[PDB]
Amino acid sequence: ALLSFERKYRVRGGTLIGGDLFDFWVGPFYVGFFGVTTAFFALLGTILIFWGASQQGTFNPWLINIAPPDLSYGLGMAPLMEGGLWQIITICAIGAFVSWALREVEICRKLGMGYHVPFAFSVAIFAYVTLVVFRPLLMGAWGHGFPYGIWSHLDWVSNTGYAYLHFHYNPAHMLAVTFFFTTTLALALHGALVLSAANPPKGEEVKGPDNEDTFFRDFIGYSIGTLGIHRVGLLLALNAGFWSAVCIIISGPVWTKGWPEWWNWWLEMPIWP
Amino acid sequence: DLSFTGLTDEQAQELHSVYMSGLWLFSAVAVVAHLATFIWRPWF
């Protein structure tokens, strides 16, 4: 089933690899080389998770937990029932995420658009890879990654935060939190302004961009425009992701003491009496 | 005759012959390698 305007866009071509060996649709979904790889990796990972759950002893979604190996194994391969399953599932997840991004690139190419969406997804992929690959590699053990469980991956965050004592004193954490809050506020304001323009009180005509510009200059004295708001939102979200990755990567391999101690450079500058 | 790729029957036969030849050569090399490895360090 197609939308009323969809048929004229479903043309052949625009693939990075494969040609027309995989150039078709299944329902609404587009299939390609990277669709095939995505299906393989995602299905294998999910089935392996459920096999590990059956061998653990519980099928409760809240209670399933698949964990990385002990620190004494270093960077080698562990027995499959003591941490190897986590490593295999990690490999599957990385493959699946990269395949998803490349499939998005192929769809963008076929539709004649820019490649902003795959680029934006790459930052989330980068944060995940920093969490599970780069930090354990620098720290020297695969056992530093977080476990795969709905409620057990919060205990990891808690214990990792309290291992540097007071984690709110991390400056990069401060920057990331600020970016998150500002992104949410901007999204609320943008949605509200567009809806208010398009949906006036009953019996009234609709409004235009001049009206929106006037509301915000009256409200706060400045208006960013209908093109600047999208740039600003994208930049804020990407900065949030990037600084989250930086804040986690500096906690283990670069700083070892508690985070309040870091501000001693400010507290003891020579310029003070 | 049914064809989605535009090839004919004769062309498909001729291509399949060479493809089978390559497959058999690959398999023979792999068999020799597996025999040597088993002699060196046997599983099973």
Binding site: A188, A197, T214, R231, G233 | -
Partner: protein, 325 residues
């Protein structure tokens, strides 16, 4: 490569836009005077000003200035009026809520009176600002979506500072006015009542915050990628559908199996953002008045994980082995 439309290649400038008007006569209260900034013109509009001056805006400005000055002068007096030491310890100072022994009674100025006066002024300022944002939309003959989304954040603000201390029966339950001192309050609040992770409404709030950031990333990238078809003019695309909207919908339909409209994506965005403080305030209001230990609650309702291995370093290594002796 192709132009990506992040910074404008060339800028143009004309007469300043003073704004639209109607029978409500908005021009009467507007300031005269505008400026142009070429540094911010690379990313957005360059014009600065003018602004609207009403009663609500002036009242809000005066009360907020008073709150700021009260906090600042208390912090300055707490250090002996020494300016270099005031600068040295700026991030560590605060104006502190009253002691638990006073209940809801009025405390002395030394032990929370100034805190109460400052809180009253801040409350007046915020409510006046909300009134101004409602009145402007009423006089522009537009919808009231901005006011309703500001009211959703004001709900969590009020729950944190007013409603919960009244329900618990003590003004000592509020938040201190300081930078490092309010991050100390956050951590201590989490520790005091068990683990705030196991509060299901804190988890719902995190869900909605993560989702709103994800949605803004998606929407910004998508609109920037169809701008070559004039996609940034969203209102005209709502009134008269074009190929930008069709391509934007078909991308996500071919990606994940369903899509939105040009007008319907903003409804999704509006709800994901507003649902964050509402669930957060519901979660905060239930703590201490109903539930006193969230981990024990999770154990009771059977969603706390169980661990088999042992605790302590001597089950994994040796003190000499760690030191390398």
């Amino acid at each position: 490569p192709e132009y990506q439309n992040i910074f404008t290649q060339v800028q143009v400038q004309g007469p300043a836009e003073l704004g639209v008007d109607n029978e409500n006569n908005l021009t009467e209260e507007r300031t005269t005077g505008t400026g142009f900034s070429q540094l911010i013109g690379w990313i957005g509009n360059a014009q600065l000003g003018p602004i609207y001056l009403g009663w609500f805006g002036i009242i809000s400005l005066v009360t907020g200035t008073l709150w700021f000055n009260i906090v600042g002068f208390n912090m300055l007096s707490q250090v002996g009026y020494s300016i270099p030491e005031f600068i040295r310890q700026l991030f560590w100072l605060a104006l502190e809520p009253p002691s638990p022994e006073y209940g809801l009674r009025m405390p002395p100025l030394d032990d929370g009176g100034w805190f109460i006066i400052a809180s009253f002024f801040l409350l007046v300022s915020v409510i006046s600002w909300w009134l101004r944002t409602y009145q402007l939309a009423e006089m522009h003959k537009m919808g009231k979506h901005v006011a309703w989304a500001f009211a959703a954040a004001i709900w969590l603000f009020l729950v944190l500072g007013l409603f919960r201390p009244i329900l618990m029966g003590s003004w000592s339950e509020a938040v201190p006015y300081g930078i490092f001192p309010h991050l100390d309050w956050t951590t201590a609040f989490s520790i005091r009542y068990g683990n705030l992770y196991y509060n299901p409404f804190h988890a719902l709030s995190i869900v909605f915050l993560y989702g709103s950031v994800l949605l803004f990333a998606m929407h910004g990238a998508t609109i920037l990628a169809v701008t070559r078809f004039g996609g940034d003019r969203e209102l005209e695309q709502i009134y008269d559908r074009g190929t930008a909207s069709e391509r934007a919908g078909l991308f996500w339909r071919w990606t994940m199996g369903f899509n939105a409209t040009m007008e319907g994506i903003h409804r999704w965005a509006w709800w994901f953002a507003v649902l964050t403080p509402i669930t957060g305030g519901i979660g905060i209001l239930l703590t201490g008045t109903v539930v006193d230990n969230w981990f024990l609650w999770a154990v009771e309702h059977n969603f706390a994980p169980d661990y088999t291995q042992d605790y302590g370093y001597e089950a994994y290594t040796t003190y000499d082995g760690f030191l390398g002796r």
